[PDB]
Amino acid sequence: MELYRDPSQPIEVRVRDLLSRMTLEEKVAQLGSVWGYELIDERGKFSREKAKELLKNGIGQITRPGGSTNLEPQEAAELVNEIQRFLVEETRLGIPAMIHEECLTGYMGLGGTNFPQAIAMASTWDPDLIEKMTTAVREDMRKIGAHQGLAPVLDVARDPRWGRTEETFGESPYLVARMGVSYVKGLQGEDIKKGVVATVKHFAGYSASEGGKNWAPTNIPEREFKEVFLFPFEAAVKEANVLSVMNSYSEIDGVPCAANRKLLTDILRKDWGFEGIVVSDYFAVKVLEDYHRIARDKSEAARLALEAGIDVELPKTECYQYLKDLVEKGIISEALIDEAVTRVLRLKFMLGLFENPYVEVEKAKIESHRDIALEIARKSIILLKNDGILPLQKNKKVALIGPNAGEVRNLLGDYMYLAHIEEHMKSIPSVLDAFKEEGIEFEYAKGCEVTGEDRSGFEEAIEIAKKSDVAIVVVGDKSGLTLDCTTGESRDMANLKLPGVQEELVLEVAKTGKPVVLVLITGRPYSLKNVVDKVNAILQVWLPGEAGGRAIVDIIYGKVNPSGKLPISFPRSAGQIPVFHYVKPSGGRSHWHGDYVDESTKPLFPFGHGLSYTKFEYSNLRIEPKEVPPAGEVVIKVDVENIGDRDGDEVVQLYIGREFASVTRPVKELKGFKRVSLKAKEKKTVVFRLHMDVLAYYNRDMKLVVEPGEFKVMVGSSSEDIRLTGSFSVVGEKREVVGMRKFFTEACEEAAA
Amino acid sequence: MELYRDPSQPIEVRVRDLLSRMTLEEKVAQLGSVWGYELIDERGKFSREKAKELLKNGIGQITRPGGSTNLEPQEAAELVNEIQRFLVEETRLGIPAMIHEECLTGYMGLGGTNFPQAIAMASTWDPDLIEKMTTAVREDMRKIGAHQGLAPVLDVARDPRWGRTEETFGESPYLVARMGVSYVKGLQGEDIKKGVVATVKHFAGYSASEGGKNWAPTNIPEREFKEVFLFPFEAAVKEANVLSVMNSYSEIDGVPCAANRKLLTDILRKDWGFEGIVVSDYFAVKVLEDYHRIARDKSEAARLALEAGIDVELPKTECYQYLKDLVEKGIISEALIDEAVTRVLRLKFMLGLFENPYVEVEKAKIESHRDIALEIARKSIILLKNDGILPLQKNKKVALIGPNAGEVRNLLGDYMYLAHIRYERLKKSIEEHMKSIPSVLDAFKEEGIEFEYAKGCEVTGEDRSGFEEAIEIAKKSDVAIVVVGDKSGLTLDCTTGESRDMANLKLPGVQEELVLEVAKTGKPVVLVLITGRPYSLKNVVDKVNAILQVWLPGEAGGRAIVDIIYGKVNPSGKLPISFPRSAGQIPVFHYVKPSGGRSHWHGDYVDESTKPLFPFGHGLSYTKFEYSNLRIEPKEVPPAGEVVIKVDVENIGDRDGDEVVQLYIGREFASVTRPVKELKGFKRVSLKAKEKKTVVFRLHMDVLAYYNRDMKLVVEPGEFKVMVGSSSEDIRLTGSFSVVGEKREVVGMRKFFTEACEEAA
Numbered sequence A: 001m002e003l004y005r006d007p008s009q010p011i012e013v014r015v016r017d018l019l020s021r022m023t024l025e026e027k028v029a030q031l032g033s034v035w036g037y038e039l040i041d042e043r044g045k046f047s048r049e050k051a052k053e054l055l056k057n058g059i060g061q062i063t064r065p066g067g068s069t070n071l072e073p074q075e076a077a078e079l080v081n082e083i084q085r086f087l088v089e090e091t092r093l094g095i096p097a098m099i100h101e102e103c104l105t106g107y108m109g110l111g112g113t114n115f116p117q118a119i120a121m122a123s124t125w126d127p128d129l130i131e132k133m134t135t136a137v138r139e140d141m142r143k144i145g146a147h148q149g150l151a152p153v154l155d156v157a158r159d160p161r162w163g164r165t166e167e168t169f170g171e172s173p174y175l176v177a178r179m180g181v182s183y184v185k186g187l188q189g190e191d192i193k194k195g196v197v198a199t200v201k202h203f204a205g206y207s208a209s210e211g212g213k214n215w216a217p218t219n220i221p222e223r224e225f226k227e228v229f230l231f232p233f234e235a236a237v238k239e240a241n242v243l244s245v246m247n248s249y250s251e252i253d254g255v256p257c258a259a260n261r262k263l264l265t266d267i268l269r270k271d272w273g274f275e276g277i278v279v280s281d282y283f284a285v286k287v288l289e290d291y292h293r294i295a296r297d298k299s300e301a302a303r304l305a306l307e308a309g310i311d312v313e314l315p316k317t318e319c320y321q322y323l324k325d326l327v328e329k330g331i332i333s334e335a336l337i338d339e340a341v342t343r344v345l346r347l348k349f350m351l352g353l354f355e356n357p358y359v360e361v362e363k364a365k366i367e368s369h370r371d372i373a374l375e376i377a378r379k380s381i382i383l384l385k386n387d388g389i390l391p392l393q394k395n396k397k398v399a400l401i402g403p404n405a406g407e408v409r410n411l412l413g414d415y416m417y418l419a420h421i422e423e424h425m426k427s428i429p430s431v432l433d434a435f436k437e438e439g440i441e442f443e444y445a446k447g448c449e450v451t452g453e454d455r456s457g458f459e460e461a462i463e464i465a466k467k468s469d470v471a472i473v474v475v476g477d478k479s480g481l482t483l484d485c486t487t488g489e490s491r492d493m494a495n496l497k498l499p500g501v502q503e504e505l506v507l508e509v510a511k512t513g514k515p516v517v518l519v520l521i522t523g524r525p526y527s528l529k530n531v532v533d534k535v536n537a538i539l540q541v542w543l544p545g546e547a548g549g550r551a552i553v554d555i556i557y558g559k560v561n562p563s564g565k566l567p568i569s570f571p572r573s574a575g576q577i578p579v580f581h582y583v584k585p586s587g588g589r590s591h592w593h594g595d596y597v598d599e600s601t602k603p604l605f606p607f608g609h610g611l612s613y614t615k616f617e618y619s620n621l622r623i624e625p626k627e628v629p630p631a632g633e634v635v636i637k638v639d640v641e642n643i644g645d646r647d648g649d650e651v652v653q654l655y656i657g658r659e660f661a662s663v664t665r666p667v668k669e670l671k672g673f674k675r676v677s678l679k680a681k682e683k684k685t686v687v688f689r690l691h692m693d694v695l696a697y698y699n700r701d702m703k704l705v706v707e708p709g710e711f712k713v714m715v716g717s718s719s720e721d722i723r724l725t726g727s728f729s730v731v732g733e734k735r736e737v738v739g740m741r742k743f744f745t746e747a748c749e750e751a752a753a
Numbered sequence B: 001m002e003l004y005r006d007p008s009q010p011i012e013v014r015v016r017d018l019l020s021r022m023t024l025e026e027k028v029a030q031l032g033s034v035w036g037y038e039l040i041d042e043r044g045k046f047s048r049e050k051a052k053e054l055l056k057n058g059i060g061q062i063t064r065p066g067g068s069t070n071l072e073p074q075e076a077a078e079l080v081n082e083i084q085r086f087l088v089e090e091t092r093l094g095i096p097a098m099i100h101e102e103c104l105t106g107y108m109g110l111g112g113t114n115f116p117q118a119i120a121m122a123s124t125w126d127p128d129l130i131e132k133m134t135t136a137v138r139e140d141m142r143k144i145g146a147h148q149g150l151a152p153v154l155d156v157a158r159d160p161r162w163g164r165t166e167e168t169f170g171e172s173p174y175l176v177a178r179m180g181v182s183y184v185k186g187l188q189g190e191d192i193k194k195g196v197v198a199t200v201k202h203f204a205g206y207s208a209s210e211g212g213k214n215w216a217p218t219n220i221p222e223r224e225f226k227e228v229f230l231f232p233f234e235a236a237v238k239e240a241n242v243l244s245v246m247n248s249y250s251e252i253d254g255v256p257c258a259a260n261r262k263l264l265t266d267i268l269r270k271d272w273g274f275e276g277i278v279v280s281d282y283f284a285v286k287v288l289e290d291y292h293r294i295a296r297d298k299s300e301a302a303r304l305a306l307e308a309g310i311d312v313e314l315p316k317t318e319c320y321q322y323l324k325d326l327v328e329k330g331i332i333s334e335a336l337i338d339e340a341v342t343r344v345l346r347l348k349f350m351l352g353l354f355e356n357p358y359v360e361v362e363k364a365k366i367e368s369h370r371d372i373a374l375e376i377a378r379k380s381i382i383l384l385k386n387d388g389i390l391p392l393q394k395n396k397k398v399a400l401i402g403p404n405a406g407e408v409r410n411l412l413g414d415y416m417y418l419a420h421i422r423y424e425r426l427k428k429s430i431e432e433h434m435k436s437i438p439s440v441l442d443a444f445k446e447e448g449i450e451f452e453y454a455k456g457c458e459v460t461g462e463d464r465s466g467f468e469e470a471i472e473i474a475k476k477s478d479v480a481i482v483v484v485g486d487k488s489g490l491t492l493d494c495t496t497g498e499s500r501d502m503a504n505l506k507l508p509g510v511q512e513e514l515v516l517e518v519a520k521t522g523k524p525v526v527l528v529l530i531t532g533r534p535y536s537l538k539n540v541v542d543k544v545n546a547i548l549q550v551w552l553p554g555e556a557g558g559r560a561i562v563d564i565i566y567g568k569v570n571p572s573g574k575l576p577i578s579f580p581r582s583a584g585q586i587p588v589f590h591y592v593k594p595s596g597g598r599s600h601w602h603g604d605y606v607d608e609s610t611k612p613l614f615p616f617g618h619g620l621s622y623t624k625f626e627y628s629n630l631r632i633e634p635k636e637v638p639p640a641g642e643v644v645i646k647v648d649v650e651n652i653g654d655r656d657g658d659e660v661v662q663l664y665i666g667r668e669f670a671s672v673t674r675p676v677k678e679l680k681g682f683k684r685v686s687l688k689a690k691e692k693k694t695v696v697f698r699l700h701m702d703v704l705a706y707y708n709r710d711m712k713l714v715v716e717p718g719e720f721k722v723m724v725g726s727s728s729e730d731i732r733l734t735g736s737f738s739v740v741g742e743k744r745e746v747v748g749m750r751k752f753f754t755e756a757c758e759e760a761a
């Protein structure tokens, strides 16, 4: 029995033993990948014939054995068992494969629940609920033999033109970091042998491209890069022990992230102590040549990516095969191959793959998590505006108008299987279905398509509105990767107008003088400047997946009290970009008239905005001690009372302001929050335990510091709807924050007195 | 006498002698300033009473003795002579004042020519002509006793939302640097005792504020900062020997430029060898407290600005008076005061102020340079579009429509005196002096055109009252000339200028609707934009027959527009900045990386092209130019070698005209990503009909240097692409040459510019 096969030996001993036994060819194969679809026949069964060519020397990863085959869970599990049996039994060393799938909004394959999009997850401000979700996704993935999910997007979004806004947790480094750590914790176990490797992406800056254009340069200076952009990845590595990172397609200031050793090694591995694998974004190595034009051939692209710190080329071996030739010709040292292979082998051993690489096909049927999807959908929907029309009485005749009332497909995000892809059909409930099921009397008129300028349908929509009590206009996006989609990866929107003639559809329906409820089923903020004052209520419904219809109707009729809060600012117009809550004293205004000539510098809806069908009263602000030394702790308490007549969740938000630091600081920035459930007339105390570590920022010399001085405390229902204000002082000498530090405020509830 | 008063002693000896004689109070006064208006009575005469308080211990600078007093040139000269006599005769040490004025578009005071705005200057692509202009401004300034002009703005503009776009030379670091060096050379001349100190501003990044908003953070990473924003300042310091720099109001990534020693000292003085004075932007020191909130009081703001490298607080001593208290209390070293005073005194001696601080009031009448202003206006106007309607025949009946056809005030930029300065006596005096400037209406009458004028709308507001009159005059005419765009200045009623940022880039008020209404008559339409920024023309471009871009042209504007419309002048201006299709497209610039200027993998936005409506270098002619016979010699050059690029250009059309020949350089397979194409050379060439000439670009490899992964300035072996054309998109001839040898680190002084000339074909 070779040491690497012996389960009593420590993993480092098994890794060293296996590495010492491997040829150069076997080493380079562990840094590569193959598509699931390249290993099946036309009957969807494992093809030994194809495996003999592609798997002869073993392999790092199988890419999307479920997601790329259109196989049902048990068929996918059978394919993976067969791939593994070939590797374990018909290769010299019998190294098993790691399998990855997409899983952002749930396992991206047939039979997997479509959870609401990441921007919806963020809008819950409920990290525990996102952890519950990814704990369910973990079980789904392990059933089909999948070890790695291309997991939370930790890109901080302040440019809603960008088609991937829907995949982010929004504009706030704090909220993004807090959701990212809960997401990673749910996916990964305490013990990864019983869990799924999370992949934080896209490291780093990919959400701040020139003009919001996909893959365009992300030109971010160092303090902003560290405090925004890197912060959530830092928290995922150090607090959540994330085991994979995927690079950004974009250059930072001349350097493609896939060729940046200062980023993928010096920051990620050396500064932060990351011990997992870096996987390329798909084709990110090859396009160092094709797109960025800094690699003269595939072998130079391979050298740049390996030197940078990419361990696995995805989604298929292309450049990394030439690492063999680079060593044989003495261009690179085999020792650098060994370093990457060591990280891959370590993770394979930790995942339990050498003890048992197989799953029980009989237990591989994936269960529905519609219950969890529905709780996210119900908590994620945001009431942007309500003049009193909502909630509606069930006896009102409804004119249900718009492309996103009827569609079902337009409820789905860019990484939901049925959008991303006769096969496990769209038996997903529509909004129209949810209205029927709720017993509402309505007529449906489509009014218009998502795209185009055809106004044919306007007259039917107008006529249905005139014969109704209330018009419910359901407009917004089709999310995906193709030209006909208005949002999603590769679908960037310069001017932030609702797609096609949807805005004109709303204004035409409004001209009937009937009450209008505007339901935005969208992947990004749109400019509502021209419709906001012409409609009575506005619901923001971030691409909600399969639970969307029921949640929208539940909220419209007050069976659910809306509790979602914006995780990203809604610009008045594209020309206002960017707008975010944590501007410096000189940000978020034009000096000395405050506004643009043509436009407010304030967003239409601010960060943390979301209304309720009840009222919350904040009282009794306590900040103790009042003076703390630079590594001390302050305890901030507020009482919150539901003074209205409906049960509701309030999201209590802590903003911290700093002036007279050695650098300029945000006038206010989110540093804590708590979703608190309050029955009508119930009062509770929300408590924020704020360690000074959490308030650390980079000084003029790029040191992480806490400086003596006064911090402003602002607690409220949004970044603008601040209810209580106070301060505390840090007293003592400037502190350099070195090594491990706290990233998060600790937020809980107490009985009020 | 004392060594400092002895003109046979070297300046360094005179400086050391004077410094050793000065009290702490006299030293700190040399780092301060006083407004001209603080030293006059109500009649605009020098007030000894006021001077005894403000000038008792001497002073660094007098701020705008002409620009802030509303005095005529000879009255301003008399005030400055009196200020100087007080300082020379009634202070202990008799140190004279340095005087500064604004002078971007000419001396900013009564009696000064209003030259076209800087964005117009850039549109000429004629650096020699801008040098001729600032040589004239130099004589104007020296007549009234003014020693320093706050002029060449070297901010690189790629965000047309920004109200100060009009003050820049546009988007191209190369074109900005090339115009900046000519601007500075004209103002300074070879010996500064006979010249005027140029002040490059605003150091550094002030044109790239968050959302195009005035003073908002300018968050620029290091390679882009060095190659785009710093480059023109670097060329101005090292090639043009500029003697003053003014800081930016903005923070870079948490650090206000006024408090940034790494910027104002480590880059400017240590890395580049700048020997002149850094002057604050107005109140830039005080607002370290009031705006940025990083100084707890005026004394801490003073310490941050002095440590950073600001020598003179403008426009009035406010924080810098507390430097005295900071030394007396042992918070800062007097040695740091001494270093700043040394720079101020050195410049005063070099200006000749200790030998003769006075001017002849009798010779202080400033001459008109309308001739130079007219050459700039005629060379700056850009023909964006022409289906053949231009030039017009003089016998066509013209409907002259729009707020900028009739309003002479809207010809003026934000630093032209009559626009900038706005008791009841000041209002009357502006309205009085305003009547002197020819209007566009005046130019049409003078040319003998048959026209009716309708002011279809105001610049701002939503009043469509005037539309009907405008439409009716259009229907009775052969051609509608619609003249629309900006009112430039600093107040709420202005649409462009400092503090007037435009988020959505729509023509102001209902001007766009006025254009579309006139177009609906089915009459031919010539659209004339009199503007300080690119506007979105997306909704009008395809509805009009011709478009002229007329960057705020000053007093020569009317005549130049009429000359061009009737073909007395062949238009030859080229865009120095990209015209976005929409605000949501921002930024668009010609020198994007392979991954810039597109969304991957469909190329375009869902709703919009990623390409500008009009690209960098765009400008049509009433003739056609044919490019042939591209030569690049040698084909292989070592990393400090030279390539000679030659093209023949023939005027194949029917009219004499100027072509601006543009050299773009591309680089792939560097160790960093490089622009697909970037302007590295240009030449304005005059061609008679059927005349052919050879344009020659002498390109030293120094000019192509870029920053590598380790932040070294390098030339790397490989291929450089040569693209010569009539715009950044209208490329006529391409080829390439190779750099062969070992990677070169470009150390110390290097060439910044291609050498461009003409020879016989």
Ligand SMILES: O[C@@H]1[C@@H](O)[C@H](O)OC[C@H]1O
Pocket (backbone or CB within 6 Å): A150, A201, A281, A282
């Ligand atoms: O997010 C990644 C995306 O950028 C790429 O196209 O495909 C792989 C994904 O994991």
Ligand SMILES: O[C@@H]1[C@@H](O)[C@H](O)OC[C@H]1O
Pocket (backbone or CB within 6 Å): B102, B150, B201, B281, B282
């Ligand atoms: O351009 C400068 C401007 O920024 C400031 O407002 O006043 C002084 C000028 O020189």
